[PDB]
């Protein structure tokens, strides 16, 4: 570890369902039903699950209830065993939701987004089985154009914290796969940024006829389906022709692909296909334009 005394008190502050007062009552009702007077734990579970549907929140509520200074005695055992039932087979998802709660609140307030949506986001990222491009397309769709870069920062900050937690969502090897996933995502952001600068110098976005988001998606599809670059660019061409010569828009894509991280494509072979097609497009356009 091996010297950080993790941790760890403060469970209630990591609960993302409701309001500080709305959560505070809920925890008291569970303190009132009842560790102080000596009930009775069956269907008390359905009360727990009714107040907090999310397992991360459910676990945090019981950990707070485990703070009561009674501290008798078999009640500890019953509280800790309900914790095991909720967590069992869901360790990853629970631990990720807990470990990223403060970041979700931090970024939630910054992005003007609901924290629990960011919690779902980080869980989805470490537990999903979708590609880097699909993941990027999903975030773009879910959170918006404005939030596309910030969302990857939130995941990175959540990952950092998760790895430093006393109970991380993954083991070393699994975080290794997550780290690789994240760097690949960051490469996509890098081309996203490169691509945006190329559209600026081309001014293909100034008038507002073309949307930066749809243009981005077009570039993302090229990373996925290089052989269909020509078809992918069809709807762009139908609009750009009004003020831009075909070769300008094709060059914008060629150069963006040229100077972007190679690893965004499935392989170098697939990257060559994209470059060869876009060059063929640029070349054909120029010859048609100057002659005549």
UniProtKB/Swiss-Prot annotation:
It is found in: Secreted; Host cell. It comes from the Bacteria. Keywords: Plasmid, Secreted, Transport, Virulence. Transmembrane segments: none annotated. GO terms for cellular component: cell surface; extracellular region; host cell; outer membrane. One of its GO terms (biological process) is protein secretion by the type III secretion system. The keyword Cytoplasm does not apply. The keyword Secreted applies. Necessary for the secretion of IPA invasins. This is Protein MxiC. The lineage of its organism: Bacteria, Pseudomonadati, Pseudomonadota, Gammaproteobacteria, Enterobacterales. The gene is mxiC.
